[PDB]
Amino acid sequence: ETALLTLDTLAKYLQEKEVQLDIEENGGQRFIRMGWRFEMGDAAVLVSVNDGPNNTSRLEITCVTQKTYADRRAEVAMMLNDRNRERAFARSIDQEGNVWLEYVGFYPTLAEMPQETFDTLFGGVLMHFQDDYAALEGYVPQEGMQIQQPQA
Amino acid sequence: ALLTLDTLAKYLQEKEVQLDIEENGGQRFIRMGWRFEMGDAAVLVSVNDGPNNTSRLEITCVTQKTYADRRAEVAMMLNDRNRERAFARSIDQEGNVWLEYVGFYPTLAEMPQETFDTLFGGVLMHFQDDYAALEGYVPQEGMQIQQPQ
Ligand SMILES: [Br-]
Ligand SMILES: [K+]
């Protein structure tokens, strides 16, 4: 009804789920920074809302592994390549070997952004990232991977 | 002007785009061919209405040129672009190159023509950039200068 796409609206949604976060600023652009501890390793999660021309804004969510895989770079690139076609989101491995998963959505500026939609999107990003992270780490627990993992 | 496939097709048709609406599986989608200076492409658009009152808007471009002989090199090139630029690039087993946009919206979200045109334009521009890099494109042929008349 009244919640629009702004960094403060998304921070509130994250706070409401008791996610610990800080709001930072580089250049002119503010962003939300979060740490996240997955079963198989730690990660950074970033969120920003960037305005553009033509009254359109970009919601960007980014996950990056703390762990690095520089010694398996070609192998990882091909694994991520196949997921980039079959699934949502954009994965890559950088020169240092950290693995990234990114989301970019384009919205009319100050579009309605309901809590349910953001939670679905955000949860979706984390679940896809966790799946890739589990594959890199060869993590395949007997009980199966928990769909909902604590930031802890 | 809500997010429905029919709305998006109206926006494209308003811009004189040639398109067909098709059904595969249970999902309807818009199918288009696109001509770039360095090669042709398939361009697909769908709106998939999912759970938690959230829908996915998907826009996909696929090169008709193929790069299977260069698969590893292309994969690394796309990888680096996937880190630094919008959207998700990949190369498939046949060697065709894909660029995907997958956006999440409240179901039946407002989707003004100005935003869709910016989004759709941005996808095409990014894909053209990648296609140009793959092909090493340089304008090869000049303007014919003979006038009307
Ligand atoms: Br993406
Ligand atoms: K998916």
Residue numbers in the entry:
A (entry chain A): 2 to 153
B (entry chain B): 4 to 152
Paper excerpt:
Our study indicates that cells devoid of DR1245 grow more slowly under normal (unstressed) growth conditions than wild-type cells, but are as radioresistant as wild type. The three-dimensional structure of DR1245 revealed its strong structural homology with type III secretion system (T3SS) chaperones and with the YbjN homolog from Synechococcus elongatus. Thus, the DR1245 protein might have some chaperone activity towards DdrB and possibly other substrates.
The asymmetric unit was composed of two monomers, which corroborates the results from the size exclusion chromatography presented above. Each DR1245 monomer comprises 3 α-helices packed against one side of a twisted six-stranded anti-parallel β-sheet with an α-β-β-β-α-β-β-α topology. The DR1245 dimerization interface involves residues from the β3 to β4 loop that interact with the beginning of the α3 helix of the other monomer. A sulfate and a potassium ion are localized at both sides of the cavity and are each coordinated by the His129 from one monomer and Arg59 from the other monomer. The C-terminus from monomer A is packed against its α3 helix and β2 strand whereas the C-terminus from monomer B protrudes away to interact with the C-terminus of the A monomer from a symmetric neighboring molecule.
